Nucleic acid binder design. Structure first.
Lengths: 104, 152, 97, 105, 127, 80, 60, 202
RNA sequence: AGAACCUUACCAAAUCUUGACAUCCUUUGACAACUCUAGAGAUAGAGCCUUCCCCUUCGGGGGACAAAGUGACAGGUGGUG
RNA sequence: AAGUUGGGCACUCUAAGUUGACUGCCGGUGACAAACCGGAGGAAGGUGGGGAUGACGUCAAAUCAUCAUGCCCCUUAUGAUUUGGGCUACACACGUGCUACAAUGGACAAUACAAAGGGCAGCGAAACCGCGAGGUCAAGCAAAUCCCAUAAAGUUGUUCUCAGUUCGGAUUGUAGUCUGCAACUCGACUACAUGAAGCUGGAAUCGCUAGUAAUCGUAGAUCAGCAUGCUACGGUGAAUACGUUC
């Protein structure tokens, strides 16, 4: 979709939302790509065969639409898993004393 | 026992390649975190670039480079209170050997390249040509201990 | 036949191994004598204080001394030491046949 | 210059928590001109006799202990700060004999 | 001719033998450079028969047991040193004065309780 | 908490099957900390005892992903 | 306080998850050894007194 | 300082065990049957000059050896109370076979007796320093070498507890050769508990 | 040297006072030694294995289960190192 | 195929019962006064290394919550009995550790070498079936043999190229794996997602004199389940002590 060039494709598809080290296996399954594909890859006939396998995935941005509403559903029921989002609470039953900083 | 007398200093084992005690002592100081092999391999690939950028064999070049590192005067602090408390004192031959090895490695770790493949060998040829960063702090000690010469 | 000799003390398991190697050679036996198995110790590390203090503790250990006796000439005179129960104080004997 | 206060079977108030820092705190702030330390105040009631106050301030070299066995927990600190201020002057004049005229050969 | 010596260092026993031939070691029935990791300490491992100069004389073919690579090495140079004094028994002073024939002098130190690990006391804040 | 037997309190399922037949009553005093929410629980109102005071709550249809105890708060936080 | 909890233990509970252990003479439950069933206080006591069988003191 | 008890150095080093059995499987439960009959023997005897007991277990014939500084009182009148003991000791466990008793000379040089008989000189509340000195002077008179004993708390009847020890003779507590025997009693005086330690040697 | 329950001593509830424990004990009433129902749940109500061993000759005493009892007593991780 | 099997090779090794290191033995100039200093003699040398052991005493030091008892207090309760909370809460503040902020590294392939300890329905192999956490039975066994268990760092090769990038992985939704009446308060992992602070840290401050600092992984006690803690274990292993004036 908006991937960068001049790097290897096993790390290049990671740059979008929704892919981490599945391009090593799952995108490598459907497409006949290799590991050493730089910017000089000629991935335009290979752009189509990755477009068929990425169309099944929720990855490119649209997963964050469903991820946002899952929190919005969770706070609307007002669950203890959901109040901890709206209140800076670590949510997954953690100790909210001194070393609980990344939620503030 | 540093107040019963002096500690008995112990023997080391010289290198097999250069047949030098001074090489093995350089291996032990670049040995970060007990890893003998992963540091000795780097020194064995940090004098080939020495022997590439100069035709001489590096066992001559090593003991020629450290002579621009090893200082002849340093500062030992004597607790005189309101005085300068910085006495220029010459260097014992054991500390003369060690403190040159210390400056050679501690400024090899602060260069532009990341690999100590060539972090080390660049500073050696600088010390072989009496320049660089580990040479210029010897002159900084020779502008500090040689400025307060009123305590010979 | 593998008569198992294990005990807590070392002076007792050695003198009870001398009993079974003596009361078998008097009979028609061909005794492979006592060879010492390695001791299966176990360390227990309690803490010394009544209430509070770690960083000052007493370690405890208990050691079992294992030996074995085997014979390969079974006569009814050799098993008279097997049926004849002696030194039952602090040694158990796991008699296998 | 914090005050880890804690009372053995006594409920600490907040009128004490301002009376401490004016006398135990401020009169030793101008001593120790490079300060970073923690104080410790014990208040131990004894129903048979009285209370007691223990103030310990550790420093780089020499600590600072004092005790009063009074029952008035406002008048006793008038004597703790007296014993504290005496002990700092012992510490400083120990190390303020740097001024010794020693001419080298 | 099999001059069979033993040798220990740092919780690693090493028994050797001496068949005549030339200098060639077969530690655990394989090559040394494919078993010992980086070939530096092997020329320090050849130090005991260096002073008796029996380089092209003896194949050894060690069976080593336990420890690590600097525990398997520095125990076969002590291994053949007990075997070199039944090859050259009058050359004992050549090995006594220089290194190999001393001992297994020292192993790891006991972890005392109330402490982090092996005489390194843990950090406390208030001095 | 395996696939095998998604857990129900089962001293509460017996008390809710009498409720869903005819017109429902709007209170079940219970504890319900152990049980999950599956679609035979919708509509009904439970007074979940949070340790202090049993709190009423009625079951919606988006509640099926979660379990019954996750709703009545026990912290009494608000504070600062 | 103490012997109510001793009486709670020795009865058979409803659940195998409860499975609760204390000591036979030590009231405390919190330092048991399931080969000895002794608290760390009296196991230190009756091994100094030798009432337990063969257990050395220390210094391996 | 924190002197540990002198028996604990020496159990097996220069001494032996007060229980000399073995059980690999079910070590726990039949260890409890020991201190069942270490409480129970100390219940009905009730200072019948008993120093200490020994337990040995072998093939459901479990032995009990008691020392009994006053011998015959546990026996009774020609095997009366010794048979009256096995009428209850064989019921608290299964077998309890071959109950017996041996005798000891020098009735108050074993330290269990020496601590106990002067701890019972404290309920009558009479002259604790002489209660000390009665034990010291009699000790090497009867054949001992080193004697040492103290009394710790509520000393004399006052409020503040004070230890009070009296000693002479070679008492090598740090030497591992030494056959040091100590004991601790629980003398109550109806104003707390007095604690009393002793130390005998040879 | 192992806080989901237990631990747990804390709190909110539901209900107990010879007390879930121990001891004299009296009639030793001699197992409510097991399932259904009602229940946050202990508990409550019924269905119930009415006994257990010896040794007399009569049906007692010893181990017999505790339904009731108090002269009593118990129980307190309540307090003050 | 390693059955380490046949024989027993018992030899070495290992595993356990005992012989030996003390200034015994010399030389100093060193005068006898013991030591010290330098040798040789054994494998070991100067209380060999380490552990255990902590004098008289100090601190009304710490526990009437391991226990035990003087005094005081409680007795329809300050004792009981249950499931349900809580001990896990948080704008914060100091202790102690873990993992890091990398190309003496990171990711993937190969390939080695340990010690200690556990296994009373417990350890559970080799096979399978799962991406994996793991499920199904038998193989062995109450154990120098059977299992936990292929230690890891290393070494060898291919890689990224010096950026908050293939550095790490905190935090949130998807697997419902397993233990357990039951994981919402309040567990343990792995699965694809998401990827935050963080570029070696100020004043200050702590540990450490050789198999020690440093690092790497493995065990056990608790325990149905659960440690970055604790206690033991080995692997690799520096630097530095001129000196007593502060």
């Amino acid at each position: 979709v908006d991937i960068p060039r001049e790097k290897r494709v096993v790390i290049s598809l990671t740059y979008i939302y929704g892919i981490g080290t599945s391009t090593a296996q799952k995108i490598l399954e459907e497409a006949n790509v290799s590991a050493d594909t730089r910017v000089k890859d000629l991935t335009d006939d290979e752009l189509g065969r990755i477009r068929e396998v990425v169309d099944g995935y929720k990855v490119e941005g649209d997963l964050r639409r469903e991820t946002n509403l899952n929190i919005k559903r969770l706070m609307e029921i007002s669950s203890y898993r959901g109040i901890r989002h709206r209140r800076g609470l670590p949510v997954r039953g953690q100790k909210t004393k001194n070393n609980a900083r990344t939620r503030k | 026992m540093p107040r019963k007398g002096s500690v008995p200093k112990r023997d080391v084992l010289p290198d097999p390649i250069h047949n030098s005690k001074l090489v093995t002592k350089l291996i032990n100081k670049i040995m970060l975190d007990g890893k003998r092999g992963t540091a000795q391999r780097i020194l064995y690939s940090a004098f080939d670039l020495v022997e590439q950028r100069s035709g001489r064999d590096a066992l001559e070049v090593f003991e020629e480079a450290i002579n621009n590192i090893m200082p002849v005067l340093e500062v030992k602090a004597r607790r005189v209170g309101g005085s300068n408390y910085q006495v220029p004192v010459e260097v014992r031959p054991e500390r003369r050997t060690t403190l040159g090895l210390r400056w050679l490695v501690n400024y090899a770790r602060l260069r532009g390249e990341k690999t100590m493949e060539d972090r080390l060998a660049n500073e050696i040829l600088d010390a072989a040509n009496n320049t660089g960063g580990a040479v210029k702090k010897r002159e900084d000690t020779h502008k500090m201990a040689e400025a307060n010469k009123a305590f010979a | 036949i593998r008569i198992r000799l294990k005990a807590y003390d070392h002076r007792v398991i050695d003198q009870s191994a001398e009993k079974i190697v003596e009361t078998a050679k008097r009979s028609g036996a061909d005794v492979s004598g006592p060879i010492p198995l390695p001791t299966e110790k176990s360390v227990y590390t309690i803490i010394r204080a009544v209430h509070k203090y770690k960083d000052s503790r007493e370690q405890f250990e208990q050691r079992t001394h294992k030996r074995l006796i085997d014979i390969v000439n079974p006569t009814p005179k050799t098993v008279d030491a097997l049926m004849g129960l002696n030194l039952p104080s602090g040694v158990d004997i796991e008699i296998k046949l | 210059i914090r005050f880890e206060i804690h009372g053995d079977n006594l409920t600490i108030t907040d009128a004490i928590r301002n009376y401490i820092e004016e006398k135990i705190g401020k009169l030793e702030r101008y001593f120790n001109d490079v300060p970073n330390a923690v104080a410790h105040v014990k208040v131990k009631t004894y129903s048979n006799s009285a209370t007691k106050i223990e103030v310990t301030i550790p420093l780089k070299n020499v600590t600072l202990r004092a005790e009063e066995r009074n029952d008035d927990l406002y008048a006793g600190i008038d004597l703790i700060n007296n014993k504290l201020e005496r002990q700092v002057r012992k510490y400083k004049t120990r190390i303020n004999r740097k001024s010794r005229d020693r001419g080298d050969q | 001719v099999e001059y069979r010596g033993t040798g220990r260092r740092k919780n690693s026993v090493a028994r050797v033998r001496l068949v005549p031939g030339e200098g060639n070691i077969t530690v655990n029935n394989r090559d040394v450079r494919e078993y010992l990791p980086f070939e530096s300490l092997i020329l320090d491992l050849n130090q005991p028969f260096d002073v008796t100069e029996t380089k092209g004389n003896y194949d050894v073919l060690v069976n080593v047991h336990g420890g690590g690579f600097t525990g398997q090495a520095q125990a076969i140079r002590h291994g053949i040193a007990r075997a070199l004094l039944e090859a050259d028994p009058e050359y004992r002073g050549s090995l006594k004065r220089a290194g190999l024939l001393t001992r297994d002098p020292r192993m790891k130190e006991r972890k005392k309780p109330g402490l982090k690990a092996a005489r390194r006391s843990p950090q406390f804040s208030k001095r | 908490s395996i696939k095998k037997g998604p857990f129900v309190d089962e001293h509460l399922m017996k008390k809710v099957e009498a409720q869903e037949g005819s017109e429902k009553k709007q209170v079940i005093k219970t504890w319900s900390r152990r049980s999950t929410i599956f679609p035979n629980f919708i509509g009904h109102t439970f007074a979940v005892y949070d340790g202090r005071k049993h709190v009423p709550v009625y079951v919606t249809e988006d509640m099926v992903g979660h379990k019954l105890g996750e709703f009545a708060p026990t912290r009494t936080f608000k504070g600062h | 306080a103490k012997t109510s909890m001793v009486a709670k233990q020795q009865k058979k509970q409803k659940y195998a998850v409860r499975e609760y252990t204390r000591c036979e003479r030590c009231g405390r439950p919190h330092s048991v050894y399931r080969k000895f069933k002794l608290c760390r206080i009296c196991f230190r006591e009756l091994a100094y007194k030798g009432q337990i069988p063969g257990v050395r003191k220390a210094s391996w | 300082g924190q002197k540990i008890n002198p028996i604990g150095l020496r159990v097996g080093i220069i001494r032996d065990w007060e229980a000399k059995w073995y059980a690999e499987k079910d070590f726990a439960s039949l260890l409890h049957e020991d201190l069942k009959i270490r409480k129970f023997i100390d219940n009905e005897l009730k200072e019948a000059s008993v120093s200490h007991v020994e337990i040995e277990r072998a093939a459901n014939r479990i032995n009990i050896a008691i020392h009994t500084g006053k011998p015959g009182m546990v026996i009774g009148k020609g095997g009366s109370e010794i048979e009256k003991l096995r009428n209850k000791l064989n019921a608290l466990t299964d077998k309890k076979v071959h109950i017996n008793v041996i005798e000891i000379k020098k009735v108050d040089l074993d330290a269990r007796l020496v601590a106990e008989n002067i701890a019972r000189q404290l309920e009558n509340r009479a002259s604790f320093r002489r209660v000390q000195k009665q034990a010291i002077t009699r000790a090497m008179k009867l054949g001992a070498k080193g004697i040492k004993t103290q009394v710790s708390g509520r000393l004399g009847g006052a409020d503040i507890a004070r230890a009070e020890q009296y000693s002479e003779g070679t008492v090598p507590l740090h030497t591992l050769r030494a056959d040091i025997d100590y004991a601790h009693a629980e003398a109550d005086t109806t104003y707390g508990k007095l604690g009393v330690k002793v130390w005998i040697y040879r």
